[PDB]
Assembly symmetry: D2
């Protein structure tokens, strides 16, 4: 008689389970952790509030934490990223999960609250796993007392790490965190190659547009912008890249992309005259990858070529000024998560109007909203780090320290390189790759242990 959950359709559980069994065969690092730690039950007594896209891959993450002793209460960190069959399989396993594809904003907030509260009272949570910082923020702002029992937060993504570092800088972070994002087997795997796999995937599912031969503008060239640009270039798009960081822009040039600004002289003065209208008027597809605000703004949207596709693969939908489009332009749903935005006005639209844009996932994370996000074998790296980070902070028992000791232990850190390498080795073996072993003479020659780590912490890969 389990009822502590809410999903779209519990009868999808059997399908979800079939895809979970397949995903386990694609996630050797994560499954290897089940075997390595199962006997030791390192998460025995952990009670984890988790907030991250309720996909099949997150299902394998959840069942790994439970297999190692944890109790969890789960929600998705995006209104469109849940795979309903994954949520169903997790619920059917007796695990509290509150998540479905297509939540309203109000439902999204309610779902997080259902993880925080059990039977109307704060759950006795002692760990947090977060993707983007929304659950972290709610706890700090609305349930600060619960943080007195929490040993740490393990944060998945660049945006959530930024929010943690803001708190650390201001002295408002109440518990230590692991920056999972900046393991190399996360940032340079998930953020880059994951978007390479899933960006063109989502655009095809949403529009079925030919990409070869067409013009794309990618805003940003950090890890997601790099992966996104490659997702498009490898399909034969002519990709142009915009950046505010000259080092990232230099990489784009060397990688064979033309670097351009939406604005004359690169100066974003807020006027239509600033827009390079010739450039925007030839762009068939714009993708925002920045984690910044309004990098595809109203004047850019006004200038875009007719029938261009607009999408965002950064964490939050405010990269694109969708608010402007809601206020001024008529939205025509093609199918779920695909809207034609008619620039002729707000008072209805002509069904045969030619002056529209296609917006994907209403501006939300497009790879998860219009497809299934990153593939299992990539998420294997990210989520193996998550499990190790949960063990790392839980075994350190920060919440049991006195305030003076807490002050010394309060930090936002990445996992040690040795763990990063351990994850990477399992990933390589999953491809059938064979890593060479240094001879003692060679290890001595370059000043490393035969067991690693093989690089200093400053190395950038």
């Amino acid at each position: 008689g389990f009822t502590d959950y809410k999903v779209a359709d519990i009868t999808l559980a059997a399908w979800g389970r079939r895809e979970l069994i397949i995903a386990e065969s694609e996630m050797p690092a994560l499954m290897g952790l089940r075997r390595k730690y199962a006997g030791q039950q390192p998460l025995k007594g952990a009670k984890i509030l988790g907030c991250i896209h309720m996909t099949i891959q997150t299902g394998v993450l959840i069942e790994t934490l439970v297999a190692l002793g944890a109790e969890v209460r789960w929600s998705s960190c995006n209104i469109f990223s849940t795979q309903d069959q994954a949520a169903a399989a997790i619920a059917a396993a007796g695990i509290p999960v509150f998540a479905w594809k297509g939540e309203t904003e109000e439902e999204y907030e309610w779902c997080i609250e259902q993880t925080i509260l059990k039977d109307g009272q704060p759950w006795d949570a002692n760990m947090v796993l977060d993707d983007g910082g929304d659950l972290t923020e709610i706890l700090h702002k609305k349930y600060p007392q619960m943080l007195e029992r929490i040993h740490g937060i393990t944060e998945e993504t660049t945006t959530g790490v930024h929010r943690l570092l803001d708190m650390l800088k201001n002295g408002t972070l109440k518990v230590p965190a692991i920056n999972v994002n900046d393991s190399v087997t996360k940032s340079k795997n998930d953020n880059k190659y994951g978007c390479r796999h899933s960006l063109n995937d989502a655009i095809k599912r949403g529009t079925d547009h030919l990409l070869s031969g067409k013009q794309a503008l990618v805003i940003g060239y950090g890890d997601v912008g790099k992966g996104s640009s490659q997702s498009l270039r490898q399909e034969g798009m002519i990709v142009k890249v915009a950046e505010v960081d000259p080092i990232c822009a230099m990489q784009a040039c060397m990688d064979g992309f033309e670097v351009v600004s939406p604005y004359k002289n690169g100066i974003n003065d807020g006027t239509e005259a600033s827009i390079d209208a010739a450039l925007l008027g030839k762009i068939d597809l714009i993708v925002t990858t920045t984690g910044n605000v309004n990098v595809c703004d109203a004047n850019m949207l006004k200038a875009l070529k007719k029938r261009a596709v607009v999408c965002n693969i950064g964490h939050f939908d405010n990269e694109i000024d969708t608010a402007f489009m809601r206020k001024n332009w008529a939205w025509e749903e093609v199918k779920p998560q695909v809207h034609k935005i008619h620039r002729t006005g707000k008072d209805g639209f002509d069904a045969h109007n030619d002056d529209y844009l296609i917006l994907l996932a209403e501006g939300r994370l497009v790879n998860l909203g219009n497809a299934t996000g990153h593939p299992s074998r990539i998420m294997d790296g990210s989520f193996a780090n998550q499990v190790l980070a949960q063990i790392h902070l839980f075994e350190q028992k920060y919440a049991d320290l006195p305030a003076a000791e807490k002050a010394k232990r309060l930090s936002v850190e990445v996992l040690p390189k040795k763990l990063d390498e351990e994850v990477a080795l399992e990933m390589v073996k999953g491809f059938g790759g064979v890593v060479t072993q240094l001879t003692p003479k060679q290890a001595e020659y370059i000043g490393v242990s035969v067991e690693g780590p093989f690089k200093p912490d400053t190395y950038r890969y």
Copy 2:
């Protein structure tokens, strides 16, 4: 004219060298931007720089930038095969002491470095060092330790040289501070990677004119040089396999679309022929070493390689390949300079029509510089703008004149501040005609940076 303080292959190549220097200047906007920015201030007035780095056209623009900012220099190459003789000639013709030519012997290589250290039989009053690989740094510390008392710093170009500096610092044997120029992003992520992408397949074509498309390559290493090398070959249509000891680098190779293999069965290098994956090596048409390590293409691998395979090294030192084994056991047939057929049939003489040979490029020395011209000017622009900024910083710091307590606080091996890295990158981007967008105040506040940068924390890996 009157000036005799140099040794180059042929001073009459100078005019040709000058024509190419003028072209290179137009390909190096960051470096020439610094030349124009600092010319009036002469920030290197009084600097006396010992330089040891490949005497290419690109190094020529670097040398003449340092001189234009007020420095005096004495130069040598850091590799026996990497000099461009017309570049050396143009520098010498400018009245600049330079001792370098393509095809030095080891003895002549050492002699050239000593000629920069000595002027008229006695130590020059040097006070700065620019090095690439650490050979000059090593000779100063071991044979001329007194000279380091007046030297304010070392600016070191490359991964191997930085490693040697960090070992000395840990041991307490480094006598002057250094700037690690290699680990600017506009160096490591530009020079080490994209430079080898440009120049590896370039050197293999000049040396052999072999078709690469459709053939099998094994790249040993997947750090920055191995990444660029692997791309240099894959973009030509090679089927590239990658070897690594570092599982994170191996993971990148897999995701980048390469099969990761080991020359040894199960990756175990126990020094026996039985450990060699002979089936694998018997299929490889080209092996490239990129590691900075020792003996990563060893005797047993060379014995097992497919007949007529090409063997080369793009790491700093030739000991990546066991060429000494090949000198001792096999007969070398020079095809043309820096290209040898190595006949595995025996030591004394060979059949001119023998089919069982390997082709070795540049005698195992850095192949891009040995068989072609190294990285192109527009890439070296980033590396060498960093060098100029590094020379200015350490010369103005005046380490050798500081009190002992201040010396102890500044005796380190450090990179340049990220703000300067970004300023070099901006000039490189403009050189492509790229346009960098400026953040609005709100956007800068939103991500927690200044509109002027720096745009990333120091931990950021790009």
Copy 3:
């Protein structure tokens, strides 16, 4: 009003299908340009076209172009899994007879084709045929030969269908002329190649969501489909190996940077398990058949494949893979529609956690249409502009009205003239915003062409 002459999955999907048709029209400038150019002339007035081709959104735009030019049509899909139900619904809601849905049984497939042939229980007075693969053409010749007496021509879409027509022509059993639409350059070297580049990786991702980067693929065939398929996988970072029986196609694979291998030791398929290269197949994560031939992924290959490899076919018919062997011997577990795990442990049930299975896509039917949506509109634009021109040409030639003696002289399988191929291509290029240069009179004289084209002799291969 009272239209019931159709059968589709769900007529209430029509509004959705119409939304997607309106989008597709903006992606199909060559086809819509023909609709605008010929609509007033009504060149297909009086044409009654039996159509058998994948009932997709793209086919919807084709159907409504033919109708807009004056034709009546009766339509079915040429594959049991390729219909898009919202496309079929939109066409039915427009009052056009269509009999098609995704997931037909073989019996239903045949019934749908017969519903186009028969109207109210009697042969429709058809006078034109548009086919993809030859199934409708075969049924007419075998079962309804009297209907062919009134048919002016067949316009055939695909390589396999063209092969079947040429067999009939050489055997003296072809009853009406055909236009080989496949071998327009704007079809074969657009649709067959780039279409599969777009849609093969698309279908694999939708069916499995597997990471492709770093994994091993074997592509059987390197014709136009095999070329596009190999690129679909290589651009994702797969390590792709290619098999071929044609040495010229194999030469291209090598030069394109693929390793060319055979499933069989030394390429010799003697029918025994012993001839299988078990080491090779035990490394393969994905096999794709692209040949139009029979049993190119056979029972012994399936037995040797790496555990959990994906198996799929993008050639026209499912007999490229020996699925019958798998139905007879192994247990099938449906993951979701058109995705099956085939458990090699036995036929009678399976362990849900068994690790020894293959994943078969679309039950071995055309995978890009079965697990995704086939080629994109802007590619199908070229193919279907050729179809419309071909229909116009054969309809206006009125073969069925000729005396027997003249029929004999007119019976042929021909391609469209190059000038029309070029005109289709020009509209495609304009759709990308490309700008074609016009020859000066002197340049056209210099190379021996008219300024307006055709620009190449008929022998040119592009």
Copy 4:
């Protein structure tokens, strides 16, 4: 005392011979024919006038023809394409060759005349091997009586085939020809992949310019244009393609290139007003690939970005209006086959002028002029076809046939597809590739012999 030759430096012969021995190991199809036909001596009595780039690869061709029984007299078909060590090795082998890198136009014609004449009188030639048609034209226009004894021409390249078809159309072709160019193992190997290998090779050797991130315009997208565009795109250039053929342009789009015209709306009205100055002002590299005339014209050259590189990889230098540059602008030699063209005026230049273009090989075929042309393992296919073509026409004995039989055989034809396949099979095995053998049932299913041919003559590959 063999002295019937003219080369730059006979002392280079040992070096040339070392490189020929290497090249033999890279040319399995050509060397396979040499070993296969040595016993039969099918060219015994053949006296071949040869005119084709005197490279190491041509050396292996020459020695194969001689090994099969032919006598030859040889010249290069371009003033810059000879490898002097290849010429020296051939001369030191006792074979008449008149060729060096850097001939004048007058010397170029002298070298061809030296092959035609022996001891001051027409040689008793009976076969022609040509590349570009210059030797063919000299024979038809200046030595027509010699064609009475000649059995055929085997023509290497697109431009030369065009000239043969013009002569055939006009009734002026006096002997039959095999179009070697349009074997698939030539046209779709040499013309495309050869330029892919050797275009960026030659630009690097001439300029050492970084190509990544820079803007290129390739004029033409036939086989040479396809291979050239790939040569630049694989280095990271942003490549734009121009074409007059919309089918070739369609391919360029699908291959991921932006298709543009130097002229507004594609219309060249001969004036500067028709030039897309904005486009050409952004181009760093222009490469002509057309076989046409004046496709990089004076107004384009005036509008190009300062310091742009200009080169031609089509057969003849008139693709670029170098005549205009010689008349109006000052040429500064950087090094052999590399000139700065100073647009400041005709009479002298400032050594530090910034307004110049870099011209490679004085507009002559750049891959052969500034590098070594195609690699041996590509030229293997072309030159195997050459040997088969020489054998076929020599054995047909056209010169001896009665007039009515000549009429039936006066044609320009390709080799049979079976031979094309057999060349390709040897090339594939040179890579270690393994071709699968059809079963009898499969051969019956697709209607081919197990031995091939596998495709109808209409197939385009």
